[PDB]
Design a protein around this motif. Sequence first.
Motif, PDB file in Angstrom:
ATOM      1  N   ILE A 400       0.852  -1.180   0.000  1.00  0.00           N
ATOM      2  CA  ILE A 400       0.000   0.000   0.000  1.00  0.00           C
ATOM      3  C   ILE A 400       0.892   1.236   0.000  1.00  0.00           C
ATOM      4  O   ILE A 400       1.869   1.295   0.753  1.00  0.00           O
ATOM      5  CB  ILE A 400      -0.944   0.001   1.222  1.00  0.00           C
ATOM      6  CG1 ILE A 400      -2.004  -1.100   1.047  1.00  0.00           C
ATOM      7  CG2 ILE A 400      -1.578   1.370   1.413  1.00  0.00           C
ATOM      8  CD1 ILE A 400      -2.739  -1.479   2.328  1.00  0.00           C
ATOM      9  N   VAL A 401       0.581   2.202  -0.867  1.00  0.00           N
ATOM     10  CA  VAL A 401       1.218   3.517  -0.827  1.00  0.00           C
ATOM     11  C   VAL A 401       0.355   4.445   0.010  1.00  0.00           C
ATOM     12  O   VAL A 401      -0.839   4.613  -0.268  1.00  0.00           O
ATOM     13  CB  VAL A 401       1.397   4.102  -2.240  1.00  0.00           C
ATOM     14  CG1 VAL A 401       1.825   5.576  -2.149  1.00  0.00           C
ATOM     15  CG2 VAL A 401       2.389   3.297  -3.066  1.00  0.00           C
ATOM     16  N   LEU A 402       0.956   5.070   1.018  1.00  0.00           N
ATOM     17  CA  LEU A 402       0.237   5.973   1.910  1.00  0.00           C
ATOM     18  C   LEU A 402       0.983   7.296   1.946  1.00  0.00           C
ATOM     19  O   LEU A 402       2.069   7.385   2.530  1.00  0.00           O
ATOM     20  CB  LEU A 402       0.117   5.377   3.317  1.00  0.00           C
ATOM     21  CG  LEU A 402      -0.418   6.281   4.429  1.00  0.00           C
ATOM     22  CD1 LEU A 402      -1.817   6.802   4.089  1.00  0.00           C
ATOM     23  CD2 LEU A 402      -0.429   5.518   5.746  1.00  0.00           C
ATOM     24  N   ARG A 403       0.403   8.325   1.332  1.00  0.00           N
ATOM     25  CA  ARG A 403       0.982   9.665   1.312  1.00  0.00           C
ATOM     26  C   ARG A 403       0.209  10.507   2.323  1.00  0.00           C
ATOM     27  O   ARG A 403      -0.932  10.912   2.070  1.00  0.00           O
ATOM     28  CB  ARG A 403       0.925  10.254  -0.093  1.00  0.00           C
ATOM     29  CG  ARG A 403       1.568  11.626  -0.230  1.00  0.00           C
ATOM     30  CD  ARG A 403       1.941  11.915  -1.677  1.00  0.00           C
ATOM     31  NE  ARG A 403       0.788  11.916  -2.573  1.00  0.00           N
ATOM     32  CZ  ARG A 403       0.504  12.891  -3.431  1.00  0.00           C
ATOM     33  NH1 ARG A 403       1.291  13.954  -3.516  1.00  0.00           N
ATOM     34  NH2 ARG A 403      -0.565  12.802  -4.210  1.00  0.00           N
ATOM     35  N   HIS A 413       0.169  -1.429  12.203  1.00  0.00           N
ATOM     36  CA  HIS A 413       0.089  -2.600  13.090  1.00  0.00           C
ATOM     37  C   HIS A 413       1.027  -3.703  12.624  1.00  0.00           C
ATOM     38  O   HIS A 413       1.481  -3.682  11.510  1.00  0.00           O
ATOM     39  CB  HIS A 413      -1.340  -3.126  13.092  1.00  0.00           C
ATOM     40  CG  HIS A 413      -1.674  -4.197  14.066  1.00  0.00           C
ATOM     41  ND1 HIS A 413      -1.802  -5.514  13.687  1.00  0.00           N
ATOM     42  CD2 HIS A 413      -1.972  -4.147  15.378  1.00  0.00           C
ATOM     43  CE1 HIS A 413      -2.130  -6.235  14.734  1.00  0.00           C
ATOM     44  NE2 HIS A 413      -2.238  -5.421  15.779  1.00  0.00           N
ATOM     45  N   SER A 414       1.230  -4.651  13.516  1.00  0.00           N
ATOM     46  CA  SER A 414       2.110  -5.761  13.170  1.00  0.00           C
ATOM     47  C   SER A 414       1.587  -6.578  11.994  1.00  0.00           C
ATOM     48  O   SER A 414       2.375  -7.277  11.343  1.00  0.00           O
ATOM     49  CB  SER A 414       2.335  -6.658  14.398  1.00  0.00           C
ATOM     50  OG  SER A 414       1.118  -7.184  14.883  1.00  0.00           O
ATOM     51  N   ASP A 415       0.289  -6.497  11.681  1.00  0.00           N
ATOM     52  CA  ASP A 415      -0.240  -7.168  10.498  1.00  0.00           C
ATOM     53  C   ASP A 415      -0.017  -6.381   9.212  1.00  0.00           C
ATOM     54  O   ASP A 415      -0.439  -6.846   8.142  1.00  0.00           O
ATOM     55  CB  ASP A 415      -1.742  -7.443  10.661  1.00  0.00           C
ATOM     56  CG  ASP A 415      -2.032  -8.573  11.644  1.00  0.00           C
ATOM     57  OD1 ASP A 415      -1.092  -9.307  12.007  1.00  0.00           O
ATOM     58  OD2 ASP A 415      -3.204  -8.710  12.058  1.00  0.00           O
ATOM     59  N   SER A 416       0.593  -5.205   9.277  1.00  0.00           N
ATOM     60  CA  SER A 416       0.931  -4.455   8.079  1.00  0.00           C
ATOM     61  C   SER A 416       2.285  -4.904   7.520  1.00  0.00           C
ATOM     62  O   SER A 416       3.186  -5.288   8.258  1.00  0.00           O
ATOM     63  CB  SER A 416       0.949  -2.944   8.375  1.00  0.00           C
ATOM     64  OG  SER A 416       1.999  -2.592   9.238  1.00  0.00           O
ATOM     65  N   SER A 417       2.399  -4.851   6.196  1.00  0.00           N
ATOM     66  CA  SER A 417       3.618  -5.244   5.508  1.00  0.00           C
ATOM     67  C   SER A 417       3.707  -4.501   4.175  1.00  0.00           C
ATOM     68  O   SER A 417       2.697  -4.208   3.530  1.00  0.00           O
ATOM     69  CB  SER A 417       3.674  -6.774   5.303  1.00  0.00           C
ATOM     70  OG  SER A 417       2.914  -7.188   4.186  1.00  0.00           O
ATOM     71  N   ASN A 418       4.941  -4.170   3.781  1.00  0.00           N
ATOM     72  CA  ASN A 418       5.191  -3.513   2.496  1.00  0.00           C
ATOM     73  C   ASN A 418       4.333  -2.258   2.333  1.00  0.00           C
ATOM     74  O   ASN A 418       3.764  -2.006   1.271  1.00  0.00           O
ATOM     75  CB  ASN A 418       4.954  -4.468   1.327  1.00  0.00           C
ATOM     76  CG  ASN A 418       5.861  -5.678   1.349  1.00  0.00           C
ATOM     77  OD1 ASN A 418       6.692  -5.835   2.240  1.00  0.00           O
ATOM     78  ND2 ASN A 418       5.693  -6.554   0.367  1.00  0.00           N
ATOM     79  N   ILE A 419       4.229  -1.472   3.398  1.00  0.00           N
ATOM     80  CA  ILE A 419       3.581  -0.169   3.340  1.00  0.00           C
ATOM     81  C   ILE A 419       4.655   0.874   3.062  1.00  0.00           C
ATOM     82  O   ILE A 419       5.667   0.935   3.771  1.00  0.00           O
ATOM     83  CB  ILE A 419       2.838   0.154   4.648  1.00  0.00           C
ATOM     84  CG1 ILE A 419       2.024  -1.042   5.143  1.00  0.00           C
ATOM     85  CG2 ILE A 419       1.934   1.361   4.433  1.00  0.00           C
ATOM     86  CD1 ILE A 419       0.857  -1.410   4.219  1.00  0.00           C
ATOM     87  N   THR A 420       4.443   1.678   2.019  1.00  0.00           N
ATOM     88  CA  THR A 420       5.347   2.764   1.635  1.00  0.00           C
ATOM     89  C   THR A 420       4.716   4.062   2.118  1.00  0.00           C
ATOM     90  O   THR A 420       3.773   4.565   1.503  1.00  0.00           O
ATOM     91  CB  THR A 420       5.552   2.779   0.119  1.00  0.00           C
ATOM     92  OG1 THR A 420       6.126   1.537  -0.304  1.00  0.00           O
ATOM     93  CG2 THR A 420       6.462   3.914  -0.301  1.00  0.00           C
ATOM     94  N   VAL A 421       5.226   4.605   3.223  1.00  0.00           N
ATOM     95  CA  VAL A 421       4.653   5.789   3.857  1.00  0.00           C
ATOM     96  C   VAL A 421       5.539   6.992   3.571  1.00  0.00           C
ATOM     97  O   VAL A 421       6.762   6.931   3.754  1.00  0.00           O
ATOM     98  CB  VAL A 421       4.490   5.620   5.374  1.00  0.00           C
ATOM     99  CG1 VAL A 421       3.825   6.870   5.966  1.00  0.00           C
ATOM    100  CG2 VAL A 421       3.700   4.365   5.692  1.00  0.00           C
ATOM    101  N   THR A 422       4.875   8.081   3.184  1.00  0.00           N
ATOM    102  CA  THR A 422       5.522   9.395   3.045  1.00  0.00           C
ATOM    103  C   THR A 422       4.712  10.299   3.981  1.00  0.00           C
ATOM    104  O   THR A 422       3.498  10.206   3.962  1.00  0.00           O
ATOM    105  CB  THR A 422       5.496   9.884   1.591  1.00  0.00           C
ATOM    106  OG1 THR A 422       4.231   9.709   0.967  1.00  0.00           O
ATOM    107  CG2 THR A 422       6.604   9.243   0.784  1.00  0.00           C
TER     108      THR A 422
END
Length: 443
Positions: A400-403, A413-422
Motif C-alpha cells: 500500500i502507498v500511503l501519502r 500494526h504488526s499485520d501491516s507489511s510492504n507499506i510505503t509511507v511518506t
Amino acid sequence: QTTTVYSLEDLLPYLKQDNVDVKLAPGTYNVNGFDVGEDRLFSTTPLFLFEGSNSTYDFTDVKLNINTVVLTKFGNNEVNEIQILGNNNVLKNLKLEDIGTTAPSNRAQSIVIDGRDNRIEGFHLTIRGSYPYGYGDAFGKGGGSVINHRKHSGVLIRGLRNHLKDCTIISRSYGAIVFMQAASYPTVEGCYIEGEMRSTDDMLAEEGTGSPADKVDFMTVWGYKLPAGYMMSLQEGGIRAYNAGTTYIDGVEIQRATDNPTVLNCTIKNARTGVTLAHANGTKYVEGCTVLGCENGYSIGSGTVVNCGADAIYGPVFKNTYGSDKGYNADITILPPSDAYYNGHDAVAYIGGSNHNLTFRSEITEIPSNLKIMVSGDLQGLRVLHGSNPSQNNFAGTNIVLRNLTNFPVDLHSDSSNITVTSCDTDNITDNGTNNSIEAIDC
C-alpha cells in the motif's frame, strides 16, 4: 407541445402513456388518508407509477404534501410514493414532503427508479415516518432485529443508466437516504443529502424510562450493550450500494448486484456513511464530494476517489471494508470540523487489503489525541467491537502507498507489511509492521 394539468386526478392518466410532455401547474397538492381507497384518488401503491417511456414531467413550483398516514393505508404492503417503470423519462423540479411522522405498516420508499435511461432532476424531498426512530441501526436493520423496524428510505436507484441530478434529499426517517439495488451504471450527481445525529450517551440516558431500548437493556444486534461515546446517525447510508436486489427493465425481472456506480459533486451530511460502494461490482468512481459529520466517510472497496473531502468529527474519513479490498485509489482531504469532535472510533482512517494508493491532505493543526491513521489493527468501531462483523476488522494490509500530507499520526500494526509511507512528520509514526518504508517530506 406540453399539456398542462391542474389536479392530481388529471395527472394520473398520463402516467400510463408514452411520449408525453406534461406539466402539473404550480401550486400545492395535498394527499391525505381520505385520498386512498377503492373509489378514491389512489387505490394502489405506488401512488405515482410512471409506466410510460420517453416522457417529460414538469413539476416546477409544485409542492406535493403526502400525509404519512398514507403509509398505513395499504395493509401490510410496502408503500412507494413514486416508481418509475418505463424508460427515457425525465421528472423535474418537484418539492415533495412527508407530513407528520407516522410509521409505515410495513416499510416505505419515497422514490424507486426502475427501467433505463431515466433522470430525476431538481427534486426537493423531505422523508419522515419510520420506526424505531432515534436509535439508528443499533437494534436491527434487517432480520433478527432486537427491535422490529418499519423503515422509510429515500431514493432507491435500480435499473440501467438511471440518473439522480441536482436534488436535495432531507431525511428525518430511519432508512437509507439514497441507495442502489441491482442498479447498472447509476449516477448520482450534484445532490445534497442530509440526515441527523444522536449520541449513544443520549440513547443510554433512556435508562429507567421504559423506552424500547430500555426494555431490551440496550442490548444491540452486534452482541453487546450499546457503548457510550459514539455519535450515530438516525438514518442509514447517505449513498449506499447493496450487493443484492431486484429490478425491472423492458419486461424483464433482474436479480443482481449493483455495478459501475458513479457519484459526482455530492454533499452528504449526518448520515451513517457518506459514500459506500464496496458492495458494488465493476468500475467505482467518486469525484468532487464533501462528507460532513457522517459516521464513515468513503468506502468504495476498489476504484477511484478523487478530489473528495470529509471531516472526522464522528468517524473515519476512509475505511477499507474487507481484507479483500484491492486497488483502492483515493485522494481525500480531511476537512475542518463542521462541529465539535465526538469520534468514538479512535481513528481517522482504517486501511487494509492490498495494492492501494492513498493520499490524505489536510490543513488541520489541532489533532484530537485519540485520532490516527491506522494500517491494520483493532479498529474501535461502534459495530466491530468484540468480534462483531469480524470480516470488517482486524485484517492485514500489504503493498500500500500511503501519502500522509496531514498532521495526523500513523500507526502501522504488526499485520501491516510492504507499506510505503511518506509523511509531513515521521516522529508521530509507530511502525510495528514488516518491511515498511517511512520517509519524510517537506510540508
